[PDB]
Amino acid sequence: STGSATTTPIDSLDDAYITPVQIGTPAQTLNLDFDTGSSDLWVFSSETTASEVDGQTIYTPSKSTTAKLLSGATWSISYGDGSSSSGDVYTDTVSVGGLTVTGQAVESAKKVSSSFTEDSTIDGLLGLAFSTLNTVSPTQQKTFFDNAKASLDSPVFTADLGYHAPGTYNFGFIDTTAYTGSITYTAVSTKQGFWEWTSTGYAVGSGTFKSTSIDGIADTGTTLLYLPATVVSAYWAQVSGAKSSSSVGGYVFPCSATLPSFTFGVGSARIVIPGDYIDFGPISTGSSSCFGGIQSSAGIGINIFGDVALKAAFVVFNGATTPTLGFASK
């Protein structure tokens, strides 16, 4: 089997991407944030504290003839940005782009943090990291991909995120028309539960490539590109007037600037992030100070190849017995 679904930016900045997902019988369609950096499929629901729901579409398990309470199971997750959610668990039928999993754990939120409430466009998350990170207790549950894998034509999914435009998540096949040149595959460590890999270096604009190992995670659920302070300083030094602002929470730059590109290495291959992908717009409405899309990972504890990086590539998440990651230009 295969599946193919369009993923759409939630706003004009590509802050996140939402993908429609069918849950239950009859189908209830929710727009979920596909997150290769976590491993829980959780939704706003009829059980979510009413004051914490503000415009989201909810899953109502009592209206699904295939929903079953997973007795005694609870979940609770905290994300790198400080947001969180928790609740109980149903199993139900879940379909993405024509690919159906029966008995998928659907984690129903009883509580969500303010950041989730305040984002009306995201109805929940669909985790695509390794199932070892799943938070369901006392019996850990599998991700949608893990459940689907054996049925797929090939045990892979691909992320093809758009810049200020829709893109695609495919399951079970590589669309050879969706990228240019070849896909370069690189080793993955699953030791921390992430799609963790080592970039071979970087360049800023038309500058020379610096060969250096950068361990990080491919994370569709993180907006920005978080890299070591040395790398980030080298980037922003090429933008007149750019500075790190403790008050704002990272590098800002004059909105009048033209940003240089940023290249990262995948083996001997190179992925070029155009400068415009690194512009996240005014820090507040009407400001001439703009927020940068490349930020320091210092004090995160890990480097993160988030959407800024991934959307410059066609990315293969190869879930073969020994997982790997593939990147192609597009």
Short mmCIF file of C-alpha atoms in Angstrom, two decimals, residues 18-320:
data_model
loop_
_atom_site.label_atom_id
_atom_site.label_comp_id
_atom_site.label_asym_id
_atom_site.label_seq_id
_atom_site.Cartn_x
_atom_site.Cartn_y
_atom_site.Cartn_z
CA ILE A 18 -0.87 20.83 8.62
CA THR A 19 -1.96 17.64 6.90
CA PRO A 20 -5.52 16.30 6.87
CA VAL A 21 -5.99 12.99 8.67
CA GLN A 22 -9.14 10.84 8.75
CA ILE A 23 -9.94 9.38 12.19
CA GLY A 24 -12.78 7.01 13.05
CA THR A 25 -15.94 5.75 11.37
CA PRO A 26 -17.51 7.72 9.81
CA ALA A 27 -14.33 9.68 9.19
CA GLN A 28 -13.59 12.75 11.28
CA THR A 29 -11.00 14.84 9.44
CA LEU A 30 -8.53 16.73 11.61
CA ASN A 31 -5.57 18.81 10.44
CA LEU A 32 -2.49 17.48 12.20
CA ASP A 33 1.09 18.69 12.49
CA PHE A 34 3.27 15.82 11.24
CA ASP A 35 6.25 15.79 13.58
CA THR A 36 9.34 13.69 12.86
CA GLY A 37 10.69 14.83 16.24
CA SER A 38 8.06 13.11 18.42
CA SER A 39 6.11 9.88 18.52
CA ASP A 40 2.59 10.56 19.80
CA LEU A 41 -0.53 10.99 17.67
CA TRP A 42 -2.68 13.25 19.81
CA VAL A 43 -5.78 15.28 19.05
CA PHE A 44 -8.04 17.96 20.40
CA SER A 45 -11.15 16.10 21.40
CA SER A 46 -14.57 16.15 23.03
CA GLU A 47 -12.63 15.47 26.26
CA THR A 48 -10.43 18.57 26.03
CA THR A 49 -11.04 21.12 28.79
CA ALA A 50 -13.54 23.46 27.14
CA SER A 51 -11.68 26.69 27.97
CA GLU A 52 -8.60 25.28 26.23
CA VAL A 53 -10.35 24.78 22.89
CA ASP A 54 -10.45 27.88 20.65
CA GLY A 55 -11.40 27.09 17.06
CA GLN A 56 -9.79 23.67 16.62
CA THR A 57 -11.64 20.75 15.12
CA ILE A 58 -12.16 18.03 17.72
CA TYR A 59 -12.24 14.25 17.59
CA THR A 60 -15.33 12.84 19.31
CA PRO A 61 -14.68 9.15 19.97
CA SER A 62 -18.29 8.48 21.02
CA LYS A 63 -19.33 9.25 17.42
CA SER A 64 -16.91 6.71 15.96
CA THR A 65 -18.15 3.14 15.72
CA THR A 66 -14.58 1.86 15.53
CA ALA A 67 -13.24 3.77 18.56
CA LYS A 68 -12.30 1.74 21.61
CA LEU A 69 -11.02 3.14 24.90
CA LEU A 70 -7.56 1.75 25.63
CA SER A 71 -8.26 0.88 29.21
CA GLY A 72 -6.01 2.46 31.81
CA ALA A 73 -3.79 4.19 29.26
CA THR A 74 -2.72 7.79 29.72
CA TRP A 75 -0.22 10.07 28.00
CA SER A 76 1.62 13.29 28.76
CA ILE A 77 4.16 15.06 26.60
CA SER A 78 6.28 18.18 26.82
CA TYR A 79 7.89 19.66 23.73
CA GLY A 80 11.14 21.54 23.22
CA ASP A 81 9.33 24.85 22.98
CA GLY A 82 7.84 24.39 26.44
CA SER A 83 4.36 23.43 25.24
CA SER A 84 2.58 20.33 26.54
CA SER A 85 -0.56 18.20 26.45
CA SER A 86 -1.95 15.11 28.16
CA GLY A 87 -4.96 12.83 28.31
CA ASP A 88 -6.26 9.32 27.69
CA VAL A 89 -6.14 6.95 24.72
CA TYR A 90 -8.43 5.31 22.18
CA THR A 91 -7.64 2.96 19.36
CA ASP A 92 -9.35 3.78 16.08
CA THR A 93 -8.96 3.66 12.33
CA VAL A 94 -6.64 6.38 11.00
CA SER A 95 -6.06 7.16 7.32
CA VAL A 96 -3.54 9.52 5.73
CA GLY A 97 -3.78 10.21 2.03
CA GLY A 98 -5.48 6.89 1.31
CA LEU A 99 -3.28 4.75 3.60
CA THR A 100 -5.29 3.17 6.43
CA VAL A 101 -4.15 1.81 9.79
CA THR A 102 -6.63 -0.01 12.00
CA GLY A 103 -6.09 -0.05 15.75
CA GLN A 104 -3.97 3.11 15.79
CA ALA A 105 -3.51 4.71 19.21
CA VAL A 106 -5.25 8.08 19.09
CA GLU A 107 -4.29 10.08 22.15
CA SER A 108 -7.20 12.25 23.22
CA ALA A 109 -6.23 15.50 24.95
CA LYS A 110 -7.84 16.32 28.26
CA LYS A 111 -5.43 19.26 28.73
CA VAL A 112 -3.33 21.33 26.36
CA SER A 113 -1.01 24.27 27.07
CA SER A 114 -1.78 27.80 25.98
CA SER A 115 0.37 27.68 22.84
CA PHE A 116 -1.86 24.92 21.47
CA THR A 117 -5.11 26.64 22.45
CA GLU A 118 -3.93 29.82 20.79
CA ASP A 119 -3.22 28.11 17.47
CA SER A 120 -6.62 27.48 15.93
CA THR A 121 -5.14 25.86 12.82
CA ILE A 122 -3.52 22.81 14.48
CA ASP A 123 -5.92 20.09 15.63
CA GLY A 124 -3.15 17.88 17.04
CA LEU A 125 0.17 16.21 16.21
CA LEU A 126 1.08 13.04 14.34
CA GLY A 127 4.45 11.81 15.54
CA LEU A 128 6.85 10.22 13.07
CA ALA A 129 9.98 9.70 15.21
CA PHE A 130 10.73 6.25 16.63
CA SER A 131 8.10 4.55 18.77
CA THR A 132 10.54 4.32 21.69
CA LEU A 133 9.67 8.01 22.40
CA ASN A 134 5.92 7.38 22.62
CA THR A 135 4.59 8.58 25.98
CA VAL A 136 1.61 6.27 26.50
CA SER A 137 1.66 4.54 29.87
CA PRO A 138 1.64 1.80 31.03
CA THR A 139 1.82 0.25 27.55
CA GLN A 140 3.82 2.26 25.01
CA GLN A 141 2.12 2.60 21.63
CA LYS A 142 3.38 2.60 18.06
CA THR A 143 3.41 5.51 15.61
CA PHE A 144 1.25 5.58 12.52
CA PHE A 145 4.32 4.84 10.39
CA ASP A 146 5.41 1.95 12.59
CA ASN A 147 1.92 0.42 12.34
CA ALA A 148 1.71 0.94 8.57
CA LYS A 149 5.25 -0.14 7.73
CA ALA A 150 4.78 -3.83 7.06
CA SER A 151 1.93 -3.08 4.65
CA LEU A 152 3.75 -0.39 2.69
CA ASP A 153 5.26 -1.10 -0.73
CA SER A 154 8.56 0.15 0.71
CA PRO A 155 9.15 0.96 4.41
CA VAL A 156 9.64 4.69 3.88
CA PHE A 157 7.94 8.03 4.09
CA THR A 158 9.01 11.28 2.43
CA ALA A 159 8.65 14.92 3.38
CA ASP A 160 8.49 17.51 0.62
CA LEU A 161 7.68 20.76 2.40
CA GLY A 162 6.96 23.90 0.40
CA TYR A 163 8.30 27.40 0.82
CA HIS A 164 5.24 29.60 1.24
CA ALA A 165 3.34 26.86 -0.63
CA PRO A 166 1.80 23.42 -0.12
CA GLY A 167 3.88 20.27 -0.26
CA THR A 168 3.50 16.53 0.20
CA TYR A 169 3.96 13.66 2.63
CA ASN A 170 4.14 10.28 0.89
CA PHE A 171 4.09 6.88 2.56
CA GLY A 172 5.46 3.72 1.01
CA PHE A 173 7.06 5.08 -2.18
CA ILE A 174 9.60 7.57 -3.52
CA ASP A 175 8.16 9.95 -6.11
CA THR A 176 11.06 10.19 -8.54
CA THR A 177 9.47 13.23 -10.22
CA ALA A 178 9.57 15.27 -6.99
CA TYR A 179 13.30 16.02 -6.87
CA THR A 180 16.25 16.84 -9.08
CA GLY A 181 19.50 14.92 -9.33
CA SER A 182 20.04 12.01 -6.96
CA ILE A 183 19.07 11.27 -3.37
CA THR A 184 22.07 11.08 -1.05
CA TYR A 185 21.56 8.71 1.84
CA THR A 186 23.23 9.15 5.20
CA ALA A 187 23.42 7.10 8.41
CA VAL A 188 20.89 7.48 11.24
CA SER A 189 21.29 6.87 14.95
CA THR A 190 18.06 5.88 16.67
CA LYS A 191 19.69 5.93 20.13
CA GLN A 192 17.78 9.03 21.26
CA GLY A 193 14.60 8.04 19.39
CA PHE A 194 15.07 10.68 16.68
CA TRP A 195 16.00 10.73 13.01
CA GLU A 196 19.51 11.74 14.09
CA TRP A 197 22.26 12.15 11.50
CA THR A 198 25.55 13.97 10.93
CA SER A 199 25.85 16.75 8.39
CA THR A 200 29.26 17.07 6.77
CA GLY A 201 29.48 20.86 7.01
CA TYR A 202 28.18 24.19 5.79
CA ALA A 203 28.70 27.30 3.68
CA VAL A 204 27.34 30.83 4.02
CA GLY A 205 26.24 32.46 0.78
CA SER A 206 28.88 32.07 -1.93
CA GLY A 207 31.55 31.35 0.68
CA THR A 208 33.78 28.32 0.87
CA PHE A 209 32.41 25.11 2.34
CA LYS A 210 33.56 24.30 5.86
CA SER A 211 33.96 20.57 6.42
CA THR A 212 32.80 19.84 9.93
CA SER A 213 30.56 17.20 11.51
CA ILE A 214 27.24 18.52 12.79
CA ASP A 215 25.10 15.94 14.59
CA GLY A 216 21.44 16.85 14.57
CA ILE A 217 17.87 15.69 14.02
CA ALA A 218 15.59 15.94 11.01
CA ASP A 219 12.52 17.48 12.63
CA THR A 220 9.49 18.51 10.62
CA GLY A 221 7.77 19.72 13.79
CA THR A 222 10.34 22.46 14.50
CA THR A 223 10.07 25.68 12.44
CA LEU A 224 13.67 26.87 12.42
CA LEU A 225 17.20 25.63 11.84
CA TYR A 226 19.11 25.36 15.15
CA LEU A 227 22.89 24.94 14.82
CA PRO A 228 26.03 25.43 16.93
CA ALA A 229 26.74 29.00 18.02
CA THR A 230 29.93 29.13 15.94
CA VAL A 231 28.03 28.28 12.74
CA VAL A 232 25.16 30.66 13.48
CA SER A 233 27.55 33.53 14.28
CA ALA A 234 29.34 32.95 10.97
CA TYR A 235 26.03 33.15 9.14
CA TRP A 236 24.70 36.33 10.76
CA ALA A 237 28.07 38.09 10.50
CA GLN A 238 27.31 38.28 6.76
CA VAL A 239 24.15 40.33 7.37
CA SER A 240 24.78 44.01 8.12
CA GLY A 241 23.09 45.03 11.34
CA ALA A 242 22.21 41.51 12.48
CA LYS A 243 22.62 40.82 16.18
CA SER A 244 21.62 38.37 18.85
CA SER A 245 18.94 39.91 21.03
CA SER A 246 18.46 38.43 24.48
CA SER A 247 15.19 40.37 24.82
CA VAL A 248 13.75 38.95 21.60
CA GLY A 249 15.23 35.47 22.09
CA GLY A 250 17.68 35.10 19.22
CA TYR A 251 19.17 36.66 16.14
CA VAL A 252 17.32 39.52 14.53
CA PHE A 253 18.22 41.50 11.45
CA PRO A 254 17.10 44.66 9.65
CA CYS A 255 14.05 43.86 7.56
CA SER A 256 15.70 45.86 4.73
CA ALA A 257 18.47 43.23 4.43
CA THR A 258 18.96 40.74 1.63
CA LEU A 259 19.83 37.45 3.34
CA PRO A 260 22.55 35.12 2.05
CA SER A 261 21.83 31.47 1.40
CA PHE A 262 22.98 28.72 3.74
CA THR A 263 24.31 25.40 2.48
CA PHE A 264 24.49 22.20 4.50
CA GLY A 265 26.32 19.00 3.61
CA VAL A 266 24.80 15.55 3.24
CA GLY A 267 27.77 13.31 2.59
CA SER A 268 29.44 14.78 -0.48
CA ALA A 269 26.17 16.42 -1.54
CA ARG A 270 24.98 19.93 -0.74
CA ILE A 271 21.53 21.33 0.05
CA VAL A 272 21.14 25.09 -0.49
CA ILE A 273 18.66 27.01 1.65
CA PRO A 274 17.83 30.26 -0.20
CA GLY A 275 18.19 33.42 1.87
CA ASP A 276 14.47 34.19 1.72
CA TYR A 277 13.75 30.93 3.58
CA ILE A 278 15.64 32.40 6.56
CA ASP A 279 13.34 35.45 6.90
CA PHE A 280 10.66 35.10 9.60
CA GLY A 281 9.43 38.64 9.34
CA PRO A 282 8.94 41.47 11.82
CA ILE A 283 9.46 40.60 15.47
CA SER A 284 6.16 42.41 16.19
CA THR A 285 3.63 43.96 13.84
CA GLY A 286 5.07 47.08 12.20
CA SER A 287 8.63 46.52 13.39
CA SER A 288 11.61 46.92 11.05
CA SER A 289 13.51 44.28 13.03
CA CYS A 290 13.02 40.82 11.55
CA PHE A 291 13.45 37.42 13.17
CA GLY A 292 16.07 35.05 11.80
CA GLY A 293 15.42 31.51 10.67
CA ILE A 294 18.82 30.19 11.71
CA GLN A 295 19.32 30.26 15.48
CA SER A 296 21.74 28.85 18.03
CA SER A 297 21.14 25.41 19.48
CA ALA A 298 23.29 26.24 22.51
CA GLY A 299 21.29 25.23 25.55
CA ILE A 300 18.81 23.15 23.53
CA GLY A 301 21.31 20.34 23.81
CA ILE A 302 20.84 19.17 20.23
CA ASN A 303 21.07 20.60 16.72
CA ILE A 304 17.77 20.64 14.85
CA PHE A 305 17.29 20.55 11.09
CA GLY A 306 13.79 21.98 11.23
CA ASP A 307 11.49 23.19 8.47
CA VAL A 308 13.85 25.98 7.29
CA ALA A 309 16.33 23.27 6.29
CA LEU A 310 13.99 20.45 5.33
CA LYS A 311 11.84 22.54 3.01
CA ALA A 312 14.93 23.13 0.82
CA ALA A 313 15.04 19.37 0.15
CA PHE A 314 13.13 16.25 -0.73
CA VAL A 315 13.69 14.13 2.37
CA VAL A 316 13.43 10.35 2.63
CA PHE A 317 12.81 8.82 6.05
CA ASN A 318 13.88 5.25 5.38
CA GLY A 319 12.48 2.92 8.03
CA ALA A 320 14.27 -0.21 6.83
#
